[PDB]
């Protein structure tokens, strides 16, 4: 019942959250703003200060907190909130699927691409492990929301 959006970073989870929250008449949260907020540093702060091991530990439980919700929010997610498997059951999960070219483009606001690529093909398998639908990213925001409320 709560509406979770996960995938890659740039994909446009943020956006289609706050609009899905609007169209929905729900409230909005953010996994790793509520994070951020909490220990009082960025994201990229809590990585170099405290460790990736403190960052998922936190995620983890987060996860756990959110679950005792009772009612529905538009839930958007970290890129890496799937290493959990705790995140089955959260809610009814949305994967944002936007292929390679697009969101490397996306991010981008000698072998090069390659690693990119297999940390790509690893975690969309994860993404579409933990799916209830997978979305199609690609025509935009507005396809995208158009697609979550048929759904």
Known sequence: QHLVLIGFMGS???????????????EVLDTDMIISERVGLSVREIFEELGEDNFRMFEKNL??????????????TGGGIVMHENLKGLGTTFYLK?????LIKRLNQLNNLT??????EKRQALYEKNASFI??????????????LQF
Not at 135 to 148: E, H, M, P, T
């Open 135 to 148: 979305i199609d990213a690609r025509g935009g925001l507005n396809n995208s929301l158009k697609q979550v």
């Open 115 to 120: 690693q990119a690529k297999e940390l790509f």
């Open 63 to 76: 996860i756990d907190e959110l679950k005792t919700l009772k009612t529905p929010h538009v839930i958007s």
């Open 98 to 102: 936007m292929d390679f070219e697009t």
């Open 12 to 26: 446009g989870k943020s956006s289609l959250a706050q609009e899905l929250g609007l169209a929905l008449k729900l």
